[PDB]
Symmetry: D2
Subunit: 305 residues, 4 copies
């Protein structure tokens, strides 16, 4: 399959996915009601754009991507269904892109967004220009380059999304495990917990699970994770720890302890222990990746918030 | 992570996996009670072999693979558990090999074995010398070359195996969906059915699902497969069908119909409609792959049984 | 080989090469008399910096890189020769970077520099953020990202350079063949011609040769190029031509004709037929690579000089 | 460019090149006067075969490959020349195959053939089933598998061949440098010598040169080789040496000394010091590639002659 066709390609969650697919070398077409700078950018990069939803727009596509739900009223969708051309939802296509890159999946019911941003800021500090996903939208610091150009794709993994268990990361973070989204799992928190174990098991045997042992549910499932693991937190027995947490004005300073390294002092612009933990997750990922102390410090301290 | 240690590396389903990991460039070590020609061949290909079990044999391992359960009486396994070295069961490591190759997963409650063998036979006749997994044992035809050398890895996928949902194939077959293994899904055939759907959704959007629509359960779940699909069977509405089934001795002849090709006359050396169907499934994969008609005929005809 | 040691890593032509090698995943170290922002950037990206020259700085290195400004008395190079560690000049290391990337070699005695710049500008318009080499110095637009990140390396190819015939490009341009550098080839123009033929034969059989047939010597060697070729110029028999050249201020307008395409009005911010020709070479490369007409029009016109 | 057409595809040096290109994923067509089992095998592997020569046979080809000189009279060759479609000689396409594989180029005026066979034998014993090239004909041990399937391509490199300096190997061997082919270089041994330096300089900085220092001309040019180099010979200063040479029947025994290894006893089934040296060269390559002593001992011992 080589031509992907987006119904509503100008839609916020959609344009960024089409751009990555263009970066990977696929043929991309798309349809939208209105033309905008977002459609002209995609066009400049090689997408075929159609204005209006006529059934013929889907002609030649090997797969369709739709924004919300499968709408057989849309003649583009209906025509593909009538010819058994697969129609995948936006969220699954988003998840697939990680199969083409060194994917860092940031799970956890709270702390996903800030941790993704801190990772991205630190990797950018190291010159790696990562593409990252927050709230379903793809981004990168560099604005003229195409999304997906980096070797790295950093994304939050929502355990209430139907593609959670289809992520294929190289590294996976679990900041915490909360019962917010029990309803996705038959309102049973034990099923939700088992899903996190399954998620962590989609890592390869050479992957890396990065786990907040300060969360007692994370600490409970740790022995079940048959993958390389690095723990972090304030806990005395965590692999990577923060001590001497202090404040200078509106900024938080602390010392990070890591295996086989000297203690490293660090600061971040945001308050609260949770942002200290989000920095530790970030420091774990960057350390394992080979990023320098200078880039870690620079990325953590420059993140606005 | 780059050195894998096998507890019982000489075992029947272990040595093949060690050999493929050697072929992929990893460092492989293992232990066994008895020195063997199996362990000698592994040593010739670069594995480090220890005779007898001693906790030091696991030193420097990034991961251990064990033959079944975690017999934590074994010193190596216990030394790994203490040092937080993941201990991965045999079948998980076997399933993960497909991420390194063009994987073909042969699923279906019955027909898995013959279909996998037929596929290997046709690809072999096409010069592709695939590695294939039957009954948990890795094989190939040319026997001096390491397992894994082929671009292709053809494996049976058992839905009662805990690794079923962790296979990452490029092409998936479903020969039939029977209720033999309802116990694995809490004695619920509907749970079983949904797992075959989840299985097929591990295909990427450019993968291929090959479905026997002669099976009514496979026909029921077909509309939920949001992946490229080719159907086969004797049903008049199948994409790839067999017609004019005849016999001459212990060999079955029939004509295969394919979209956009001329009718092809084929024989196979095995009786019954089910082997006609396993041949249809093979003809589908081979055709998608680009293998010549000549290799298809020779692959199917020369297979003994 | 995995550790490259630059003697004078902060020098003007050395720092870019080291940064690319870092982007390729090599271990990079380097010495210099003075720490600078250049040495800080490389350090932040993972290079080990030594200040001051001393024999042990080269310890562990698999290869040394030296520029013209390095004496044989330099202790680091002296120690390397004593241990049979290879010492390669900066220009050769520079020419071998194309082996990792899709290399576009911009050759031809006059116009190398503008044509390289035009290619980079057009490719950037399509969001490809290429790294490019002008006067031996590596650059890219995205300032925070590491040199070498793009799939594309566009480089001046200089026939007076000893490494001319070790370039391994995927596409090669010859703007013109002049006698300026006869002295590199025994002071014999015909040997210089033969050198250009051998240069183009470094292309793979699937590569592209882009030849200005307005140059009589380029036209003369054309039947010796056993590679795929697209010709450009004002000559009516060129594959890609400019017609209806006109002016509107400091801007030059013309129509470009391409096989199997509609005519495209184009404008560049530089005078003279030579800059029309440099634009045709750019358009040929861009068209072949798949870049949109909009990116071609925008890259060409937005270039200053 | 994606379709290669072979004029005289059944020929002795042509069919193997076509087969490797098939294994590389290219479209291959070919013409011949008589159908053969050779053309049938290639047809089974994907090649379109044409019996008899006709100008249409070259329709759609991006490059042609010819058996000797550019026949001009041949209708397919003439058709291609009229469309400016490149026509490469057999030897040039054969040398291009190395850019796709881990290429080991065995050069030297004498000993090329035995040394290539010894390398193939050792690699095969290590389970790597190399494709190797002797007398312009490609071969491999396993016979149903397509040529080119191995990661390794081992080829003799002849300095009287027009493509000698177009090889792109990973490892280069120089067994010795004689004046046999002075005529190729204007009857001047000093130019011939310089060609061997330039040949070795087509290695990347991560390549490896393997040099017999028992040859005084090899020893003379050694300091000019700015690539990683391992020396071998009987000379007391060679990096890898043979000592304790003795006989036991038609079998030569000797001990091999290697940097940072224990001495290894080996035997070969051929007489003479020159086959001790060709064995030494084979041992350098195998050692650097990581092949075990068992495979070295077995490959060398089991080679007939």
């Amino acid at each position: 399959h080589r031509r992907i066709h987006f119904v509503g390609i100008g839609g916020a969650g959609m344009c960024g996915i089409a751009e990555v697919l263009l970066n990977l070398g696929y043929e991309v077409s798309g349809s939208d009601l209105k033309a905008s700078a977002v459609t002209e950018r995609l066009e400049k990069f090689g997408a075929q754009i159609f204005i209006g939803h006529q059934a013929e727009n889907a002609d030649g596509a090997d797969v369709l991507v739709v924004s919300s739900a499968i709408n057989r009223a849309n003649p583009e969708v209906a025509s593909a269904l009538e010819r058994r051309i697969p129609v995948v939802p936006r969220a699954e296509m988003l998840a697939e892109l990680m199969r083409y890159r060194h994917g860092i999946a940031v799970a956890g019911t709270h702390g996903k967004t800030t941790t993704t941003s801190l990772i991205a800021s630190v990797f950018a500090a190291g010159g790696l220009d990562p593409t990252f996903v927050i709230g379903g939208r793809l981004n990168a610091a560099g604005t003229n380059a195409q999304l997906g150009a980096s070797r790295y794709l950093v994304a939050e993994a929502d355990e209430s999304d139907a593609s959670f268990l289809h992520l294929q990361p190289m590294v996976a973070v679990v900041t915490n495990i909360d019962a917010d989204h029990m309803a996705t799992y038959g309102g049973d928190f034990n099923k939700l917990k088992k899903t996190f174990v399954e998620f962590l098991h989609n890592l390869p045997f050479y992957g890396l699970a990065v786990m907040c042992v300060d969360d007692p549910v994370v600490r409970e499932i740790l022995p079940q994770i048959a993958r390389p693991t690095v723990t972090y937190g304030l806990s005395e027995d965590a692999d990577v720890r923060a001590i001497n947490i202090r404040q200078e004005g509106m900024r938080t300073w602390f010392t990070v302890l890591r295996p086989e390294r000297e203690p490293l002092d660090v600061s971040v612009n945001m308050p609260g222990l949770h942002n200290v933990l989000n920095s530790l997750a970030t420091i774990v990922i960057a350390t394992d990746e080979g990023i320098s102390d200078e880039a870690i410090v620079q990325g953590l301290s420059g993140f606005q918030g």
